[PDB]
Design a protein around this ligand. Sequence first.
Ligand code: NA
Ligand SMILES: [Zn+2]
Length: 403
Amino acid sequence: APKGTIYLTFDDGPINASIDVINVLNEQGVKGTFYFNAWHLDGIGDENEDRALEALKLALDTGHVVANHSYAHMVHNCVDEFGPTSGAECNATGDHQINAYQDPVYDASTFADNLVVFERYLPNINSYPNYFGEELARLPYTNGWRITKDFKADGLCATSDDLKPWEPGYVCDLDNPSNSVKASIEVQNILANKGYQTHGWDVDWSPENWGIPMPANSLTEAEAFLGYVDAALNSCAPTTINPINSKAHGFPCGTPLHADKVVVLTHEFLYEDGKRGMGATQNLPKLAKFLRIAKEAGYVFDTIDNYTPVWQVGNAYAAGDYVTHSGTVYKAVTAHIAQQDWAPSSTSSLWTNADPATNWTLNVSYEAGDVVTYQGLRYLVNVPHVSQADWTPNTQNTLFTAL
Ligand code: NA
Ligand SMILES: [Zn+2]
């Protein structure tokens, strides 16, 4: 059995550099998960991106998973009026993380916009089984997680209302997080209610010297980075990670679904020869070498659509095991072997729904203290129970108390 599973994930494509990263992965059979921003398809993302559509097609045609990172990386919150030059304008100030989330309803809606743009540029995108745009997301800047009803985390220092973490006077108060962080938490919850899972990361393959003129050249070496992975294994890395704005607060250390897994965050723009350094000439070899020695160290590589295992006929499940089935998270009621006619569902006796959503949902094991939303109103669970269709919170006064 493997030492563990690494989920190599790439943020902020599709850009020209994505093609070179993908090719490297393909020559070793490794599949990645790509958290894409469609504004690069529109040509306003201030990267080398004339081949962005080519790169999206290549990701899909060679089996990589495409996921939702929002249309424009929240850059509308970086400028007064979003437009074709906002990306460069925000790159000039480096203020990406300041007021990064403002109106959570609007900001969450830019994940929906992202999908509309993908489906205009690639009309058959939903005929690809590896297109997970509607089901997997990651918030810009934010190591926040929405995995199951009992597996969630928020980056409480991820973004700021004024000061960047290194400026004099910067403070993060975990009991009074920034307005930006509070808005981002609401974004997480909106997406969970639309059926997304969101995944953060354990380790960020990033420049070791943010300060040199060509920072991409300081990308950690393959051997040293494997050391970071090894150290992340089963050590609750999302909470121990540095810098402060990268921590995932509340992450349930030791949760079984994270056991023996390491989610790596990196960015394809770090693997390009250009304004950030000779990332292609120096860093693509580090990537290729990482894949080789990771596999030799006993690791296997997988994509985020398998982080929660997909339900499969014939597999053995223990009580408490989590799966996804047709995109929905379920928790096994009893140990059993899966059979084709008894799949998870809203009426299954073998599974309960354990999506990280907070809207009232059928076949959920509700506990005292849970709060559900139903017909626009909030209800507290009074009596633990498994929900069912007749027990809608507005009419079930024994089981729910309106807030
Ligand atoms: Na889902
Ligand atoms: Zn990003």
